[PDB]
Amino acid sequence: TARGTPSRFLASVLHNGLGRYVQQLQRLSFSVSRDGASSRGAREFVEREVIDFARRNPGVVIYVNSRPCCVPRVVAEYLNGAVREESIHCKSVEEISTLVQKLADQSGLDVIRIRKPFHTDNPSIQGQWHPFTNKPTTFRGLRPREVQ
Amino acid sequence: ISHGRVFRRMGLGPESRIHLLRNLLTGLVRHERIEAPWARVDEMRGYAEKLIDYGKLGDTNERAMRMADFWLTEKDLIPKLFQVLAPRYKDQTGGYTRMLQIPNRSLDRAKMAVIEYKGNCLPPLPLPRRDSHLTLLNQLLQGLRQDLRQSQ
Amino acid sequence: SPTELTEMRNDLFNKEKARQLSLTPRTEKIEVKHVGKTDPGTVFVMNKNISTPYSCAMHLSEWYCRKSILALVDGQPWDMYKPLTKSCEIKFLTFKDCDPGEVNKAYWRSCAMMMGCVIERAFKDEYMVNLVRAPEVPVISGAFCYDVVLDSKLDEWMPTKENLRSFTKDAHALIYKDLPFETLEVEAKVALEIFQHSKYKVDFIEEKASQNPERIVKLHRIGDFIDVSEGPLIPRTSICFQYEVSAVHNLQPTQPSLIRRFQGVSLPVHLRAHFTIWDKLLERSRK
Amino acid sequence: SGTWWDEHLSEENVPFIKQLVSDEDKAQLASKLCPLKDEPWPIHPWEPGSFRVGLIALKLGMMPLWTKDGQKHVVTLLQVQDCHVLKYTSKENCNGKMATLSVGGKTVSRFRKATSILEFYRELGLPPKQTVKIFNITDNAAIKPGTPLYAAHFRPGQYVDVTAKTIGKGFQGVMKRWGFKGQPATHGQTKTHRRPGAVATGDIGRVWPGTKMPGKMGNIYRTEYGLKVWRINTKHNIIYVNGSVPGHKNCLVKVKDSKLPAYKDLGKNLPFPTYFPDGDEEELPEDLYDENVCQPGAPSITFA
Amino acid sequence: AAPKNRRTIEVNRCRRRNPQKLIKVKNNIDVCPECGHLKQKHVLCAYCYEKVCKETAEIRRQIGKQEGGPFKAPTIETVVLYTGETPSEQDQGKRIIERDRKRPSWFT
Amino acid sequence: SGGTTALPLYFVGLYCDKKLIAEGPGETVLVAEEEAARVALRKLYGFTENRRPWNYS
Amino acid sequence: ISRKWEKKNKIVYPPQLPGEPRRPAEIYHCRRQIKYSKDKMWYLAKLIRGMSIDQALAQLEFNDKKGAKIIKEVLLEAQDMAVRDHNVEFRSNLYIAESTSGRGQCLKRMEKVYCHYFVKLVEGPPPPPEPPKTAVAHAKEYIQQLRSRTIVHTL
Ligand SMILES: [Mg+2]
Ligand SMILES: [Mg+2]
Ligand SMILES: [Zn+2]
């Protein structure tokens, strides 16, 4: 629920698309058990999908190890320091590919209510409204019901 | 409404009130100092004063003798009243008893009070003195004593 | 340029204070026996030249610290903040003892020093104020006096009541600030080798110790202020609660200069005096 | 912190301070007895539609007093003690109503008051009063603060209104407080003898505000109107007001001219601004009497 | 009648911790300036009063031991004398209640 | 607007020989003058709010 | 049954550097199974909440409630332990940092109530009370709130 949940404003890491786009995900750790039944989709992903993903994303360092011994997991680390874990136990190779792409396609901010859908740093060009725009002025700057 | 009623209400009625105060007064005449609940002592102080007043008239008077017969229960004390207390206060015309408040009672946390007949033999109660005459405020007031006396 | 004269005093004051405090050879111990009817027969074990009588008072109870106003060691008054020096005997003097003589004297000379630290900065910098002395007067007199000399340009200026009100407000600011009365034992040469600005207290400085066999003198410091007095002072300026400088006097033999004299009267927080009694006391602080 | 005046004084100092402050009080009281040798204010002749200050008296007790027509008339004794006009506030200082005077009564100790009140009275040169009351007067009735007021301020033959704090009965049930016919005795009225009946009707689920119910009684200010003045004792400053007056004995009451719309006139023959004993106009005797009082020392009445 | 609803901890806290129900800090305690014990102003030093009651009880025990039994209120004054105190010139003809400890400093 | 209250608004405008060169808001007239100086400085130094945004392409 | 309070007198901090401010010492102490309700002991516990030890003892010596002497004995034992073991210098240089009363165990007949009393004494002088909110502070915070308004629900 909104009231019962944090929130943030719409933002980017380092003005990402301004100069040059940079890919925020920088490290991806796969733990895949060589024997466990829950590590089957993970084993398929590593055997026939991780090389292609590594080639398509050369800014991400992908480590894979075989010592959880019962449960797999993927831990994604980002430029801005954020970590994000996702379960891949008992999932299909399609699901794991979709998930890993999702991880590589987002900035490491928090997935919480974005208050505004548009963030602008220079919201005004003609000058933000104040009660004296569109209001006349009178001779010598007199207030109403003055004399001098 | 209780406007202008000077007598406390205690005991099981008026009579028990007189009897309670009578026992307190007898204890006071026998020992010359007793610790009792504060309100009861404050009620008994007037009676002890007037008892000394009646005792000054002396044995020969019969009204005083009847009164001291009622208000003293162990009669060995009636001699004392007429031969040790009343003679002792031949000078004072009032205020024969001093009444203080003391630490509340341990059990029922009642307001206590020690009451005694002035001049007895007992070790003296720790009365509270006033501030020494040599304290700063008193010294300034003494200077004002002098300076006002000379002017007048 | 008085605003640098204060610094020129305080820097050397702190210098001597530090050089004295650094003479202690690795925290030696002294024994202070306590005498008096209250809590008698205790033996404090203190530090030879760090612990003060307060360091002893706090050992006993907050009551002793709150009520104590001066300390007898070897049966002579000894300020509360002044460090001890040797295995001694101690007792604490308050305002409500039977004989508050020494305490009253200390209180009134402390009030004199406070009035000094108030008057000196009271005037416009273009004038030149020079503190003469704190003439010791008995408490019975009716007010404490402080002799100062104003610059000759003010002969036609007898202070008006409003300016006395300003003096009182400033003194109340000083007490409200709650500064302590630090003390310092110093060889008499500071007054003869540095303090050239001593023009009228140049007389007092020999009165410090020329009379006594030793060649050491006492300095008292409120804080960014220094002055000598003839005895111990009360520990904090908060002790005073009611305070007022009433009027001023002049001494007729006006050959050297106009020796203005300032009168004031005060009481501690303990011995507060009711409003009307205080008015009566003030009326007599004008003699 | 917390303390009273003579807590720290020594044994031989309390009597002196008592004597000194009492002497100063007497001196200050005496140094205001002549308000015309000081600087008075304009004394205008009375004209219709004006109002003049009143007094703060102290209720002594009651007595009878008969009349030449043969009837009886209880009266109440009001002693004017130290009644001084204390303050003045201007017509538009109260923002339109009238001019006002603050009058005080019944000198009190000075060790038992707040600092502000002591400052006020010190600047005014008087010892503190007990009750201060505000009288609404016209502009021309002004009196300089510091002047005294005296029982001769009134004269017999007029009517006068008196306001005071009634006697406090404490918390009272409903029949002692509002005259409620409680419920009968036996015939079985168990546990209901002196009780209110139905507090309110049934359809409304509330008790109206202003319903008569148990609670504190008396001890509120209230006014009696139309009391006539029979006698004045100008040596002890007593006023003999007809009928009974609220309050208990030795409690301060506020006396002023009758405001009822049948005595609006007859403020003329009264001394308008006040009575000044220093006017020296055929100095008043010890007792001023109404035209119809069988005063003592006179022959016993006869009806022929 | 009976309650219609439980009362919450909030209402109960606004009642129980209201100032009117709190224990007031006492502004009238101080220290016996000579004896140095705590006391209220209008009340006797508790320690001093106890040390007085002890001596009163000892004196009264001696009085009882001398009077024998009940119903023996003497018809003369009484004076109490501690060790090494001969009956003064004013106390002849007054019963003496001897005690066997040095007179207390506070006994005048 | 609101000259006497505790929440005033003063709009102070600098001029240079009968021609405006800035305009600033504030609560005190001193602060409004300071802000008018700041906006005039920005206009002269070419650093306004609506300047030609930097050209990253 | 949890004995946590008396275990906070065993946290051994690291030896201080000669630079950092001297750390104020502490002592935690508790009385268990006080035959007294908790809703009554709470008033005494709150009375002495923010005052030094000596003033607390003074205030308790002259209070009427039964738990006053229990709190007093607890505070005296705490002071003695603080000086004797926790290397406090001046036995008057302590103040009641935390005072609270808690429920107890024993059985019924009608509950037979019990309660514990928990006190934390912190070395040093009492901290001054929070001063009243002066009118200038109220105006300052109202201005702060008026000066943080943004245009709501737009760019
Ligand atoms: Mg009863
Ligand atoms: Mg019945
Ligand atoms: Zn004592």
From Swiss-Prot, chain C:
Keyword terms, alphabetized: Acetylation, Leigh syndrome, Mitochondrion, Primary mitochondrial disease, Ribonucleoprotein, Ribosomal protein
Subcellular location: Mitochondrion
UniProt key word Ribosomal protein: yes
A Gene Ontology BP annotation from the UniProt entry: mitochondrial translation
Annotated GO MF terms: nucleotide binding; RNA binding
Residues recorded as bearing N6-acetyllysine in the entry: K91
GO annotations of cellular component type: mitochondrial inner membrane; mitochondrial large ribosomal subunit; mitochondrial ribosome; mitochondrion
Tissue occurrence: Isoform 1 is ubiquitously expressed. Isoform 2 is heart-specific.
Keyword check for Amino-acid biosynthesis: no
Domain TGS, first and last residues per copy: 28-94
UniProt record similarity statement: Belongs to the mitochondrion-specific ribosomal protein mL39 family.
Clinical disorder: Combined oxidative phosphorylation deficiency 59: An autosomal recessive mitochondrial disease presenting with multisystem manifestations of variable severity. The disease spectrum ranges from lethal infantile Leigh syndrome to a milder disorder characterized by hypertrophic cardiomyopathy, lactic acidosis, attention deficit-hyperactivity disorder, and survival into adulthood.
Subunit and partners: Component of the mitochondrial large ribosomal subunit (mt-LSU). Mature mammalian 55S mitochondrial ribosomes consist of a small (28S) and a large (39S) subunit. The 28S small subunit contains a 12S ribosomal RNA (12S mt-rRNA) and 30 different proteins. The 39S large subunit contains a 16S rRNA (16S mt-rRNA), a copy of mitochondrial valine transfer RNA (mt-tRNA(Val)), which plays an integral structural role, and 52 different proteins.
Curated annotation (Swiss-Prot), chain E:
Family under the similarity heading: Belongs to the bacterial ribosomal protein bL32 family.
GO cellular component, one term: mitochondrial large ribosomal subunit
List of residues binding Zn(2+): C32, C35, C45, C48
Mitochondrion keyword on record: yes
Keyword annotations: Mitochondrion, Ribonucleoprotein, Ribosomal protein, Transit peptide
Name of the featured protein: Large ribosomal subunit protein bL32m
Secretion signal span: none
One annotated GO biological process: translation
Region (Disordered): 86-108
Role description: Component of the mitochondrial large ribosomal subunit (mt-LSU). The mitochondrial ribosome (mitoribosome) is a large ribonucleoprotein complex responsible for the synthesis of proteins inside mitochondria.
Subunit structure: Component of the mitochondrial large ribosomal subunit (mt-LSU). Mature mammalian 55S mitochondrial ribosomes consist of a small (28S) and a large (39S) subunit. The 28S small subunit contains a 12S ribosomal RNA (12S mt-rRNA) and 30 different proteins. The 39S large subunit contains a 16S rRNA (16S mt-rRNA), a copy of mitochondrial valine transfer RNA (mt-tRNA(Val)), which plays an integral structural role, and 52 different proteins. bL32m has a zinc binding site.
GO MF annotation list: RNA binding; structural constituent of ribosome
Cellular compartments annotated: Mitochondrion
Compositional bias segments (type: Basic and acidic residues): 91-103
From Swiss-Prot, chain F:
Subcellular location: Mitochondrion
Domain DRBM: start-end pairs: 1-46
Disease entry from the Swiss-Prot or TrEMBL record: Combined oxidative phosphorylation deficiency 16: An autosomal recessive, mitochondrial disorder characterized by hypertrophic cardiomyopathy, liver steatosis, and decreased levels of mitochondrial complexes I and IV in heart and skeletal muscle.
Role of this protein: Component of the 39S subunit of mitochondrial ribosome. May have a function in the assembly/stability of nascent mitochondrial polypeptides exiting the ribosome.
Subunit structure: Component of the mitochondrial large ribosomal subunit (mt-LSU). Mature mammalian 55S mitochondrial ribosomes consist of a small (28S) and a large (39S) subunit. The 28S small subunit contains a 12S ribosomal RNA (12S mt-rRNA) and 30 different proteins. The 39S large subunit contains a 16S rRNA (16S mt-rRNA), a copy of mitochondrial valine transfer RNA (mt-tRNA(Val)), which plays an integral structural role, and 52 different proteins.
Family: Belongs to the ribonuclease III family. Mitochondrion-specific ribosomal protein mL44 subfamily.
Protein name: Large ribosomal subunit protein mL44
Gene: MRPL44
Part of the full-length chain shown: 261 to 317 of 332
UniProtKB/Swiss-Prot annotation, chain G:
Domain of life: Eukaryota
Subcellular location: Mitochondrion
Gene Ontology cellular-component terms listed: mitochondrial inner membrane; mitochondrial large ribosomal subunit; mitochondrion
Keyword Ribosomal protein found: yes
Residue stretches spanning the membrane: none
UniProt key word Phosphoprotein: no
A GO molecular-function annotation: RNA binding
Keyword annotations from UniProtKB, A to Z: Mitochondrion, Ribonucleoprotein, Ribosomal protein, Transit peptide
GO BP term, example: mitochondrial translation
Entry's family note: Belongs to the universal ribosomal protein uL22 family.
Subunit structure: Component of the mitochondrial large ribosomal subunit (mt-LSU). Mature mammalian 55S mitochondrial ribosomes consist of a small (28S) and a large (39S) subunit. The 28S small subunit contains a 12S ribosomal RNA (12S mt-rRNA) and 30 different proteins. The 39S large subunit contains a 16S rRNA (16S mt-rRNA), a copy of mitochondrial valine transfer RNA (mt-tRNA(Val)), which plays an integral structural role, and 52 different proteins.
Protein name as it appears in the record: Large ribosomal subunit protein uL22m
Organism, scientific name: Homo sapiens
